[PDB]
Design a protein around this nucleic acid. Structure first.
Length: 118
DNA sequence: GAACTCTGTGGTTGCG
DNA sequence: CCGCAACCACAGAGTT
């Protein structure tokens, strides 16, 4: 599906909603794509940091690279990012040595998530 | 049946 | 004083 470029010329990840509700399933399945070669089985995790929150509590943030793609099963953000602020996520691919791909200011996570005006 | 899970609406409220 | 954008609670309807 939709893909965005990361900090690294070797990895591309799915595009994430601009604003999403904590502990709620994502509208798409987050995936990480490897252009170079990554042997199957290789682990990939994702961390979501912020100026305020340092590494938001996540759910299901670890996947294994199957045929150049690490399909995350129902990844979820439990920690909030702070009024008006977003999460930058770090993609770490555990090959030797570990490679890293950062997806700057990707998604804001609030208790309500996007809501109809009042 | 109890105990979750999910998603929307209502009550509040600092900070512009 | 107004409102947005957040937080907190919890109701209703499904699930496990």
């Amino acid at each position: 599906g939709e893909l965005v470029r990361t900090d690294s010329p070797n990895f591309l990840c799915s595009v994430l909603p601009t604003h999403w509700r904590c502990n709620k399933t994502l509208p798409i399945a987050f995936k990480v794509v490897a252009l170079g070669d990554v042997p199957d089985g290789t682990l990939v995790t994702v961390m979501a940091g912020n100026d305020e929150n340092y590494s938001a509590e996540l759910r299901n943030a670890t996947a294994a690279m199957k045929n150049q793609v690490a399909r995350f099963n129902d990844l979820r953000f439990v920690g909030r990012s702070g009024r008006g602020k977003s999460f930058t996520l770090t993609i770490t691919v555990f090959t030797n040595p570990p490679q890293v791909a950062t997806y700057h200011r990707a998604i804001k996570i609030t208790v309500d998530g996007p809501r109809e005006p009042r």
